[PDB]
Amino acid sequence: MPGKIDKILIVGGGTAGWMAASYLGKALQGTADITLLQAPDIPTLGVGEATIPNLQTAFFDFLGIPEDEWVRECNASYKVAIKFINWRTAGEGTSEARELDGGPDHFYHSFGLLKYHEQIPLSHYWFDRLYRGKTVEPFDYACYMEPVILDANRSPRRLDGSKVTSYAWHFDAHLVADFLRRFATEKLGVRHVEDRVEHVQRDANGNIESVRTATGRVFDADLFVDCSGFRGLLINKAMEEPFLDMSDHLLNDSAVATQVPHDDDANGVEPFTSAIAMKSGWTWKIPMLGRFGTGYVYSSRFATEDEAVREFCEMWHLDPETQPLNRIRFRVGRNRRAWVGNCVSIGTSSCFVEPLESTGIYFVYAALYQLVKHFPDKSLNPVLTARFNREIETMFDDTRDFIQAHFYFSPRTDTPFWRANKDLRLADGMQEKIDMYRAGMAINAPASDDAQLYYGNFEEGFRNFWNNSNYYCVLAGLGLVPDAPSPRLAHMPRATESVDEVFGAVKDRQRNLLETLPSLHEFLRQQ
Amino acid sequence: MPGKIDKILIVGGGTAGWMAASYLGKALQGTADITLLQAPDIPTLGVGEATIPNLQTAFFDFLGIPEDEWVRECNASYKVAIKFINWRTAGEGTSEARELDGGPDHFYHSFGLLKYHEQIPLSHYWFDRLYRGKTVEPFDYACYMEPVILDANRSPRRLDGSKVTSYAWHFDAHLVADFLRRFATEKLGVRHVEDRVEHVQRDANGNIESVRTATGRVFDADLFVDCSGFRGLLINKAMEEPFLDMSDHLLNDSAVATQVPHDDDANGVEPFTSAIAMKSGWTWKIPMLGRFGTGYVYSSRFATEDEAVREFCEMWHLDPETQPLNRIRFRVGRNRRAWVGNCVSIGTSSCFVEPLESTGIYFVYAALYQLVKHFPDKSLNPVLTARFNREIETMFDDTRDFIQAHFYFSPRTDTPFWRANKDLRLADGMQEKIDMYRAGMAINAPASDDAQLYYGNFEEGFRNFWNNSNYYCVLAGLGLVPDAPSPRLAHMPRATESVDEVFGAVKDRQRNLLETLPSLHEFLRQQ
Fold this sequence. Notes:
Two copies of one chain form a homodimer. Chain A has a single domain (1-527), classed as FAD/NAD(P)-binding domain (3-Layer(bba) Sandwich). In chain A, 37% of the residues lie in helices and 20% in strands. The first copy, chain A, has 20 helices and 26 strands. In chain A, 53% of the residues are buried. In chain A, the strands form seven sheets. The first copy, chain A, has a seven-stranded mixed sheet with strand order 8-5-19-20-21-18-22. Chain A has a six-stranded mixed sheet with strand order 12-2-1-16-25-24. A three-stranded antiparallel sheet of chain A has the order 3-11-4. By secondary structure, chain A is α+β, with helices and mostly antiparallel strands. In chain A, helix 1 (15-27) runs parallel beside helix 7 (173-187). Chains A and B meet through helix 12 and helix 14 of A and helix 11, helix 13 and helix 15 of B.
């Protein structure tokens, strides 16, 4: 029997750095010696992270950390949707929803899954009626309860603590990474070393022998986890593994972000991340406690850093000359392979796409999950590495495609940027998915419509990650709809007649919860 | 909005024909006029069909026909597993299991899902112990209850109806096909027309316009369902869609079968299908009431029709000169596309593999589920056709790959046949599964271990058709095991401690069910 993996080195102590340590530390407790190694750096401003409900179940639960413990520690707010503002109307970068067809220009992509009615998703019925002029209501307000209580800043949890929807979290990623550093080093015995990588020594098979620091210390391991971010000091720099840039699908590659103090007592707290459309990109808003993180993700090919700073500053009425700002140049795309030899890449050293669908932290634990699932012994079975790499690239490429579709099907033509997004090509696979949608099909419909079984079983919320609910939210929201209704509904007349009962169940639940839910401000006050 | 499908013509009245008619009859009820076109064929003996548990949940439940109703009507027996006799030992075509390491040469592929212990399949734990000399028990007896009661022919239902395992059915195909012809024609207004197909008329879009029968009538429809079996009267002969002969993976093409009188009161009924290895193929045994179907599937490349008749007849002690026998030349493979134009194929006209893993009927109701799901309007969107052909294509090729692995990984080398199966190449997709399997990994492990949820939600039980449990039963059974244990197990000392009480559970459940269960004969008698 071959040697198990004894000693692990994680280069990088960012957010992915410490998540890899917590997760690996608890998954190999007592059977592996983990040492993390991270260097002194200029900290960035806490500009915020938006997340996805399985952060609790796939990650914190695995560690053994109760949701209320880490939420209280890192002062996190609650997230129920992403509110997409101004993607359908022309004009300047404003925090104000423009006017489109009577009401404001927004749509909600909310957590949870559409209700099935006689083995067909609610979306199909909605569109059937929309197409035959029996409704004019937007997909989101017809099929989801969420858009109504969200308009009113209601809490996802009642005052007593009961949960009325699927939600995720907003937080300063720094504070969470600090939480996980304390946990990993204190309760899981991960060894923290503060030092700078100086030289990496490779053996004859091109694997990592040892990494040596600036103070002359040498560390050696069985498995090296590269969590160094965009630098890819192990996977790219030492291992010479190519990073596949992917700006043939994503135009954005830069950001300018800050943190803005906010009066919660006066305006309450928003139970959603806001994706606000600009002239050469979009802008995030991530509500926190008395704070909100915000960042303008732009394309450097359509706006200079100067233009992006004053566009971003004007919309928030901030002083360009005195507001602390971070200016980032992103590495958009992924490694050709995430794992080569004894080097495994976790976090932005592996891949990266703009945070339009809150996939930042997801990629890290989804990958850490995948790494444990496909875990090696000292023989480093190539089958294990191959399949691991395959899950990581379909995970990444799928999301790259989904996010591109946010720009591709925007009606806007008002700036060179919005018109430029229309000249791009969708991947062959995203292209096949639109054809399906126009044919009146569901795309990757969930196995079940049970919101809990989906976020709860991570093996299920991975294989089927971007499901039919999400595609309709974003595509029907942008205003792209099927050529004609789902051919099946013309053959299911019991079902189309009996559907307005379910359309009325969401209407009843919107109305009851609108007047039976504390403001998210009130709920947070209690916590 | 474009026209719905008003009229469908099904050509063919076999099991596939009447399943198609009953399915579509109930799915598009009130909204389509369905007509079936069967003409008399030379009748065959009732040599038996083995099934899979979702025949009740995906098909009959959908029709609204309760289990006890059709099982009583068609005098069906119960199936709990496929017992594999003499696949690992050299010798003539006998009905008796030879010796192999101090026990009969047989192993079971049962219906359950393998239990999860710390989101790792029990198979990984059993092999762990095997490798470290802690155990020596075969995979099927270690990890499933099923073999210990199947060894004693007990019933999967207690006398009070209560069910203690997943089970499917054995039955004469003829009686089920006639039960459904009554049900379709009587309770779903399907038009049965007795006539032979003389001429198929196509338009310039290559679609079928009408079929003209020998009595001189023409039938036209928007959609044509080809249920004509191997002849492929529409899909292959009219539409000229080519057939893919799969004989670089599947050597078996011929078969000689009969029905045998059985004294149930004297010997009892076997609660399983038997797959008995012969010199140039294998012989099925399908127990029924007072009867058993039996057929020697063989490769005409290695056995002449006469040699197959002699071998088969000697095996069962029958007279090659007086015993009613069916001699069949199979069409093995699938069409290049299952659905071309307005012409859809169902049953053996679409694809056929030997009945080693009981997929004949499954393929029919699988394709119908997929046809209803991807159902068209008169515009006949191509995406629906392609996505359908895609599912039918992977459903077949997967099953083909799995069937081939039964012969590939047998240890036998005694006959030209067995040696030759080892010179065949595995498909690339199969090789990858085998690579994984040897790397300790599971192959297609099911989201849950809940066998009811699996055999219940057909979309789950289809997406994850051949799962890890299937692969382990067949591969471990033949004696193919991984190169070394799952590497995760070494980092899970607490898990490998506590599986003791899980293997301990199968042993109690085996012993407790063996002494408290009635025989399948005692139960069938009561029903």
